[model samples]
Target: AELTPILPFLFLGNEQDAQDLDTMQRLNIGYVINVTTHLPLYHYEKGLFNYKRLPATDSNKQNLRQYFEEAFEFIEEAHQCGKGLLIHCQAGVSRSATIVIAYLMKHTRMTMTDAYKFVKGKRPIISPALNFMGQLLEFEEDLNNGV
Candidate 1:
């Protein structure tokens, strides 16, 4: 997995990155957010992570809107607590990236295009699902209208 340091305290990677303990430890990534429906067991000694399992479906039919606040809060918590966060789902291309994009939008006050470009600049392979992308667009609108 090609892990990219999204920010000083934020990371984005795939399943392979999820299982790599040495890399995670080196990066001091103690907080983990699994955005995928499934991630293989490489259970790091219990307390090694402040893990938050999202178990999200990568389908347009699935409503990702509910997880927005939860995911954003978790990411913000990790950031505020000075713990680096690792966000991954399946290929780290869709679900995980979607959440990160939305986080940037909500927390950073960035538009959809800017958020997409920012994440894409770091992780060039990110391609969130059409539904998630639509949600992000709507989120951008809401943010602008002060919703």
Candidate 2:
């Protein structure tokens, strides 16, 4: 079955593991959101796709709000362009999922529970870190209460 309209969400550890570049191109991916911090320059290709990298540290929660804000901008742009975005991190488990959840919360007005459940429904294997989940929940609450 072909997955159409629904953006293809992929998780790649490094640029070297991006074996599906051709497939992504075939899927008409408008942009590739690379979440790896130390990615090699060799893995990048110019003019093919808009590559935006957001490298977040696991231990650093101070910058999470900023990170999600930047990620939201990219996701919004992708939606506006009528182009799908593929967000990927090293494991596609915690960091990437955090961004996706935050994006959902920002755009859909969904609470943390609903956003997390939505992603888990589609990708059963996604298990974000507890702390990261808390951050997203806090972000949602702040947004909801107009804080």
Candidate 3:
């Protein structure tokens, strides 16, 4: 069966695992979006896979806000360019899922429940941070209430 475009695979790791990259290549991933603060381990210039990094340190509200802004821009660009986006952080649980949920909420005009459900459908075990989830809920409420 062919992979679904709407559902992207999340590979959570601090460094690029060679086996993982090989598998992604086999899966025909066009680009890699590294959402880690650490330097990339692979040779992006080799053209094996295009790479862009947007790193966010954990629990930094300011950095998280910046990440949301940048993530939106990146997603828009990826859509415009006709490319699929795969977003990953050090762990697939918190920061990575938070940004993705925020993107869905902002772009797709989904309610918080719908956005969370969409992500959960794609990755059943995605559990974001409580504080992050609270902030997102606040954003959604504010947006809906026109605050």
Candidate 4:
């Protein structure tokens, strides 16, 4: 999928997006949240665009559910601090996008379907992996049941 703008402050992209320091500078991206197993190099202006690395494996058996809260907190903090955020993983389709959807579901009080639909409307290529999708479904259930 192509790099995409999710909201005014949030953009979703792949590894390539992080490496494009010029574009990051142009967009005023002050922070990045990387969700992937391998870390890539990112360059930007001095004191601009800090990095938050989350080493999540793209495996069906690995439980990505464990990392959702911290990721959400990081993103929410950036928003509260009046900074811009760019979120990306290897391909911007599965892991990174899944975390974004989960954040929306948790903070915005959106259901799984609504969160998925919202991000998909902005970036059409999003497709969370089957196992991750299951975790999202479980999250939705927990949210409704007051967990």
Highest lDDT against the true fold, candidate: 1
Give the lDDT ranking, best first. 1, 4, 2, 3
lDDT of 1: 0.81
- Once fitted onto the true fold, the runs of candidate 3 whose alpha carbons sit more than 4 angstroms away are 1-19, 26-28, 39-45, 60-62, 145-147
Ten contiguous residues with the weakest lDDT in model 4: 40-49
What tens digits encode model 2's per-residue C-alpha lDDT throughout 39-72? Answer: 5432366566677877766554535567777877
lDDT per residue for candidate 4 within 6-72, as digits (tens), equals 7666778888767877787677678888887667646634656677878887888978788888777
Q: Model 4 segments beyond 4 Å from truth?
A: 44-47
C-alpha RMSD for every candidate? 1.6, 3.6, 4.1, 2.1
Sort all candidates by TM-score, best to worst: 1, 4, 2, 3
lDDT of every predicted structure (CA atoms): 0.81, 0.63, 0.61, 0.79
Q: How many residue pairs clash in each candidate?
A: 0, 0, 0, 0
Q: After superposition, how far is residue 132 of candidate 4 from its true place, in Å?
A: 0.4
Distance from true location, Cα of 103 in model 4, Å: 0.8
Worst 10 residues of 3 by lDDT: 10-19
The count of residue-pair clashes in candidate 1 stands at 0
lDDT against true structure, model 3: 0.61
Which regions of candidate 1 are displaced past 4 Å? 44-46
The predicted structure with the larger lDDT, 1 or 3, is 1
